[PDB]
Protein backbone atom coordinates (compact mmCIF):
# COMPACT_ATOMS: atom_id res chain seq x y z
CA UNK A 1 0.00 0.00 0.00
CA UNK A 2 1.40 3.38 -1.08
CA UNK A 3 0.42 6.57 0.85
CA UNK A 4 -1.76 4.66 3.33
CA UNK A 5 -1.48 4.43 7.11
CA UNK A 6 -0.99 1.78 9.80
CA UNK A 7 -4.17 -0.26 10.39
CA UNK A 8 -5.76 -0.19 13.86
CA UNK A 9 -5.79 -3.47 15.85
CA UNK A 10 -8.77 -5.62 14.72
CA UNK A 11 -9.57 -3.15 11.87
CA UNK A 12 -9.68 -5.84 9.06
CA UNK A 13 -10.23 -9.17 10.88
CA UNK A 14 -10.91 -10.88 7.53
CA UNK A 15 -7.39 -9.92 6.28
CA UNK A 16 -5.42 -13.02 5.30
CA UNK A 17 -1.70 -13.26 4.45
CA UNK A 18 -0.76 -15.81 1.75
CA UNK A 19 2.66 -17.04 2.91
CA UNK A 20 5.21 -18.96 0.79
CA UNK A 21 6.86 -21.78 2.82
CA UNK A 22 10.26 -21.74 1.02
CA UNK A 23 11.75 -19.14 0.77
CA UNK A 24 9.68 -17.80 3.75
CA UNK A 25 7.99 -14.74 2.22
CA UNK A 26 4.80 -12.75 1.57
CA UNK A 27 3.01 -14.21 -1.43
CA UNK A 28 -0.16 -12.03 -1.45
CA UNK A 29 -3.14 -10.78 0.53
CA UNK A 30 -6.42 -12.68 0.73
CA UNK A 31 -9.67 -12.54 2.73
CA UNK A 32 -11.60 -14.80 5.07
CA UNK A 33 -15.19 -15.44 3.78
CA UNK A 34 -16.27 -18.34 6.15
CA UNK A 35 -14.48 -20.60 8.69
CA UNK A 36 -13.12 -22.79 5.82
CA UNK A 37 -12.96 -20.51 2.76
CA UNK A 38 -10.43 -17.90 1.70
CA UNK A 39 -10.78 -15.56 -1.30
CA UNK A 40 -7.80 -14.27 -3.31
CA UNK A 41 -6.70 -13.14 -6.81
CA UNK A 42 -5.96 -15.96 -9.28
CA UNK A 43 -2.67 -14.25 -10.32
CA UNK A 44 -1.38 -14.84 -6.74
CA UNK A 45 -1.47 -18.58 -7.47
CA UNK A 46 -1.15 -18.80 -11.27
CA UNK A 47 0.77 -16.39 -13.42
CA UNK A 48 2.77 -18.02 -16.31
CA UNK A 49 4.53 -14.76 -17.45
CA UNK A 50 6.40 -14.78 -14.08
CA UNK A 51 6.66 -18.63 -13.76
CA UNK A 52 4.14 -18.57 -10.88
CA UNK A 53 2.14 -21.82 -10.49
CA UNK A 54 1.67 -22.62 -6.78
CA UNK A 55 0.11 -25.86 -5.50
CA UNK A 56 -1.61 -26.38 -2.08
CA UNK A 57 1.56 -27.52 -0.29
CA UNK A 58 3.67 -24.54 -1.42
CA UNK A 59 1.90 -22.17 0.94
CA UNK A 60 0.17 -21.37 4.22
CA UNK A 61 -2.70 -19.04 5.13
CA UNK A 62 -1.95 -16.70 8.11
CA UNK A 63 -5.11 -15.15 9.68
CA UNK A 64 -5.49 -12.51 12.45
CA UNK A 65 -2.20 -10.80 11.63
CA UNK A 66 -1.12 -7.18 12.11
CA UNK A 67 2.72 -7.25 12.05
CA UNK A 68 4.07 -8.24 8.57
CA UNK A 69 7.11 -10.38 9.63
CA UNK A 70 6.55 -11.42 13.20
CA UNK A 71 5.05 -14.63 14.51
CA UNK A 72 2.02 -13.26 16.47
CA UNK A 73 1.79 -15.98 19.13
CA UNK A 74 -1.75 -16.43 20.61
CA UNK A 75 -3.14 -13.96 18.00
CA UNK A 76 -2.59 -15.29 14.48
CA UNK A 77 -3.73 -18.70 13.30
CA UNK A 78 -1.85 -20.60 10.56
CA UNK A 79 -3.86 -22.84 8.22
CA UNK A 80 -2.99 -25.37 5.52
CA UNK A 81 -4.75 -25.53 2.18
CA UNK A 82 -6.92 -28.53 1.30
CA UNK A 83 -7.67 -27.30 -2.28
CA UNK A 84 -7.23 -24.28 -4.63
CA UNK A 85 -9.97 -23.37 -7.16
CA UNK A 86 -9.00 -20.82 -9.84
CA UNK A 87 -11.80 -19.27 -12.04
CA UNK A 88 -11.89 -21.50 -15.26
CA UNK A 89 -12.11 -18.31 -17.41
CA UNK A 90 -9.33 -16.36 -15.59
CA UNK A 91 -7.43 -14.44 -18.36
CA UNK A 92 -3.75 -14.24 -17.37
CA UNK A 93 -2.64 -13.68 -21.03
CA UNK A 94 -4.02 -10.19 -21.48
CA UNK A 95 -5.73 -8.15 -18.72
CA UNK A 96 -6.25 -10.50 -15.72
CA UNK A 97 -9.99 -10.73 -16.52
CA UNK A 98 -11.80 -12.79 -13.78
CA UNK A 99 -8.73 -12.54 -11.47
CA UNK A 100 -10.29 -14.67 -8.71
CA UNK A 101 -9.52 -17.83 -6.79
CA UNK A 102 -10.87 -19.70 -3.74
CA UNK A 103 -8.86 -21.80 -1.25
CA UNK A 104 -10.52 -24.39 1.02
CA UNK A 105 -8.79 -24.78 4.40
CA UNK A 106 -7.95 -28.22 5.77
CA UNK A 107 -9.61 -27.42 9.16
CA UNK A 108 -12.07 -24.62 10.13
CA UNK A 109 -10.44 -21.53 11.63
CA UNK A 110 -11.76 -20.39 15.04
CA UNK A 111 -13.09 -16.80 15.08
CA UNK A 112 -11.67 -14.35 17.66
CA UNK A 113 -11.28 -10.57 18.18
CA UNK A 114 -8.70 -10.59 15.34
CA UNK A 115 -10.28 -13.24 13.00
CA UNK A 116 -13.73 -12.77 11.52
CA UNK A 117 -15.25 -13.14 8.03
CA UNK A 118 -16.26 -10.30 5.71
CA UNK A 119 -19.63 -10.41 3.84
CA UNK A 120 -19.95 -10.98 0.12
CA UNK A 121 -22.34 -8.60 -1.64
CA UNK A 122 -25.67 -9.52 -3.21
CA UNK A 123 -27.05 -7.74 -6.34
CA UNK A 124 -28.60 -4.90 -4.30
CA UNK A 125 -25.43 -4.23 -2.18
CA UNK A 126 -23.39 -3.97 -5.40
CA UNK A 127 -25.97 -1.74 -7.15
CA UNK A 128 -26.21 0.59 -4.12
CA UNK A 129 -22.46 0.82 -3.20
CA UNK A 130 -20.48 0.43 -6.49
CA UNK A 131 -20.96 4.03 -7.58
CA UNK A 132 -18.36 6.51 -8.81
CA UNK A 133 -17.17 8.68 -5.88
CA UNK A 134 -18.20 6.15 -3.19
CA UNK A 135 -15.19 5.11 -1.13
CA UNK A 136 -13.90 1.67 -0.31
CA UNK A 137 -10.97 0.50 1.79
CA UNK A 138 -7.90 -1.49 0.69
CA UNK A 139 -5.52 -3.26 3.07
CA UNK A 140 -2.26 -5.18 2.69
CA UNK A 141 1.40 -5.75 3.60
CA UNK A 142 2.64 -4.93 0.10
CA UNK A 143 5.16 -2.35 -1.10
CA UNK A 144 5.06 1.14 0.46
CA UNK A 145 6.51 2.54 -2.82
CA UNK A 146 6.46 1.47 -6.49
CA UNK A 147 10.34 1.41 -6.46
CA UNK A 148 10.09 -0.16 1.32
CA UNK A 149 8.11 -2.83 3.21
CA UNK A 150 5.77 -1.95 6.14
CA UNK A 151 6.16 -3.10 9.76
CA UNK A 152 2.37 -3.50 10.13
CA UNK A 153 -0.80 -3.94 8.00
CA UNK A 154 -1.48 -0.81 5.93
CA UNK A 155 -4.86 0.76 5.08
CA UNK A 156 -6.04 3.27 2.46
CA UNK A 157 -9.53 4.62 1.67
CA UNK A 158 -10.09 5.23 -2.07
CA UNK A 159 -12.97 6.43 -4.25
CA UNK A 160 -14.43 4.26 -7.03
CA UNK A 161 -13.69 5.99 -10.38
CA UNK A 162 -16.07 6.54 -13.41
CA UNK A 163 -15.69 3.68 -15.98
CA UNK A 164 -14.77 6.07 -18.91
CA UNK A 165 -12.06 7.67 -16.70
CA UNK A 166 -10.71 4.13 -15.81
CA UNK A 167 -10.80 3.26 -19.57
CA UNK A 168 -9.03 6.52 -20.60
CA UNK A 169 -6.16 6.04 -18.12
CA UNK A 170 -4.78 2.89 -19.79
CA UNK A 171 -4.10 1.06 -23.09
CA UNK A 172 -5.28 -2.20 -21.41
CA UNK A 173 -8.77 -3.47 -22.26
CA UNK A 174 -11.08 -3.17 -19.21
CA UNK A 175 -13.98 -5.61 -18.71
CA UNK A 176 -17.21 -5.55 -16.64
CA UNK A 177 -15.42 -7.95 -14.17
CA UNK A 178 -13.15 -5.06 -13.09
CA UNK A 179 -13.51 -1.62 -11.58
CA UNK A 180 -10.91 1.03 -10.82
CA UNK A 181 -10.35 3.23 -7.74
CA UNK A 182 -8.09 6.03 -6.61
CA UNK A 183 -7.82 9.78 -6.55
CA UNK A 184 -7.46 11.98 -9.66
CA UNK A 185 -4.43 14.39 -9.95
CA UNK A 186 -6.85 17.35 -9.24
CA UNK A 187 -8.19 15.72 -6.00
CA UNK A 188 -4.92 16.34 -4.08
CA UNK A 189 -5.13 13.13 -1.95
CA UNK A 190 -3.07 10.00 -2.92
CA UNK A 191 -3.06 6.24 -2.31
CA UNK A 192 -2.96 2.89 -4.07
CA UNK A 193 -2.40 -0.81 -3.67
CA UNK A 194 0.98 -2.12 -4.93
CA UNK A 195 3.06 -5.36 -5.36
CA UNK A 196 2.31 -7.71 -2.42
CA UNK A 197 -1.25 -6.28 -1.84
CA UNK A 198 -2.68 -8.46 -4.65
CA UNK A 199 -5.46 -10.75 -3.57
CA UNK A 200 -6.36 -8.48 -0.66
CA UNK A 201 -9.85 -7.04 -0.18
CA UNK A 202 -11.45 -3.74 -1.35
CA UNK A 203 -14.27 -3.34 1.27
CA UNK A 204 -17.17 -0.95 1.85
CA UNK A 205 -19.32 -0.48 4.95
CA UNK A 206 -22.99 -0.64 4.12
CA UNK A 207 -24.78 2.46 5.55
CA UNK A 208 -28.02 0.34 5.52
CA UNK A 209 -27.03 -2.61 7.77
CA UNK A 210 -23.58 -1.37 9.04
CA UNK A 211 -21.78 -4.52 7.73
CA UNK A 212 -18.55 -4.64 5.78
CA UNK A 213 -18.80 -6.09 2.27
CA UNK A 214 -15.90 -7.16 0.06
CA UNK A 215 -16.65 -5.48 -3.26
CA UNK A 216 -13.20 -5.91 -4.82
CA UNK A 217 -10.00 -7.96 -4.93
CA UNK A 218 -6.63 -6.14 -5.45
CA UNK A 219 -5.81 -7.21 -9.02
CA UNK A 220 -3.52 -4.95 -11.08
CA UNK A 221 -2.11 -1.57 -11.95
CA UNK A 222 0.63 0.08 -14.01
CA UNK A 223 3.16 1.08 -11.41
CA UNK A 224 1.78 2.31 -8.01
CA UNK A 225 0.22 5.66 -7.00
CA UNK A 226 1.10 7.35 -10.34
CA UNK A 227 -0.87 10.50 -11.30
CA UNK A 228 -3.59 9.82 -13.87
CA UNK A 229 -3.41 6.02 -13.18
CA UNK A 230 -5.79 3.95 -10.97
CA UNK A 231 -5.75 0.61 -9.17
CA UNK A 232 -7.81 -2.17 -10.74
CA UNK A 233 -9.96 -4.54 -8.72
CA UNK A 234 -11.76 -7.81 -9.47
CA UNK A 235 -15.57 -7.15 -9.27
CA UNK A 236 -16.62 -9.68 -6.60
CA UNK A 237 -20.40 -9.53 -7.21
CA UNK A 238 -19.97 -10.11 -11.02
CA UNK A 239 -18.25 -13.40 -10.15
CA UNK A 240 -20.43 -14.46 -7.19
CA UNK A 241 -22.27 -17.14 -9.24
CA UNK A 242 -18.86 -18.85 -9.65
CA UNK A 243 -18.04 -18.39 -5.89
CA UNK A 244 -21.41 -19.94 -4.88
CA UNK A 245 -21.00 -22.84 -7.41
CA UNK A 246 -17.54 -23.78 -5.98
CA UNK A 247 -18.73 -23.45 -2.34
CA UNK A 248 -22.04 -25.38 -2.98
CA UNK A 249 -20.18 -28.23 -4.81
CA UNK A 250 -17.04 -28.54 -2.60
CA UNK A 251 -17.97 -27.03 0.79
Amino acid sequence: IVEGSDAEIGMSPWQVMLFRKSPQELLCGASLISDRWVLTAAHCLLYPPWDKNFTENDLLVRIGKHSRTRYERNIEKISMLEKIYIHPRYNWRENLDRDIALMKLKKPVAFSDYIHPVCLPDRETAASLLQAGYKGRVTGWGNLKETGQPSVLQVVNLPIVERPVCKDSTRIRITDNMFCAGYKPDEGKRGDACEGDSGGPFVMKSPFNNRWYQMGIVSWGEGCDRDGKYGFYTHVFRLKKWIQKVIDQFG
Binding site: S112, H116, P117, G133, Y134, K135, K205
Partner: peptide, 29 residues
Protein backbone atom coordinates in the same frame (compact mmCIF):
# COMPACT_ATOMS: atom_id res chain seq x y z
CA UNK B 1 -22.77 -16.20 7.81
CA UNK B 2 -25.35 -14.27 9.93
CA UNK B 3 -22.42 -12.52 11.70
CA UNK B 4 -20.31 -11.60 8.60
CA UNK B 5 -18.74 -8.12 8.31
CA UNK B 6 -19.28 -7.15 11.98
CA UNK B 7 -15.96 -6.61 13.70
CA UNK B 8 -15.56 -7.83 17.32
CA UNK B 9 -13.45 -4.78 18.19
CA UNK B 10 -15.59 -2.21 16.36
CA UNK B 11 -19.29 -2.87 15.33
CA UNK B 12 -19.79 -5.52 18.06
CA UNK B 13 -18.79 -2.99 20.76
CA UNK B 14 -20.30 0.03 18.89
CA UNK B 15 -16.78 1.50 18.48
CA UNK B 16 -15.84 3.30 15.27
CA UNK B 17 -12.44 3.13 13.61
CA UNK B 18 -10.63 6.43 12.83
CA UNK B 19 -11.50 6.66 9.08
CA UNK B 20 -14.81 4.75 8.57
CA UNK B 21 -16.68 8.12 8.71
CA UNK B 22 -14.77 9.13 5.49
CA UNK B 23 -16.43 6.15 3.76
CA UNK B 24 -19.92 6.97 5.11
CA UNK B 25 -19.55 10.66 4.05
CA UNK B 26 -18.79 9.49 0.43
CA UNK B 27 -22.10 7.48 0.34
CA UNK B 28 -24.22 10.43 -0.87
CA UNK B 29 -27.46 8.54 -1.80
Amino acid sequence: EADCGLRPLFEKKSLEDKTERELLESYID
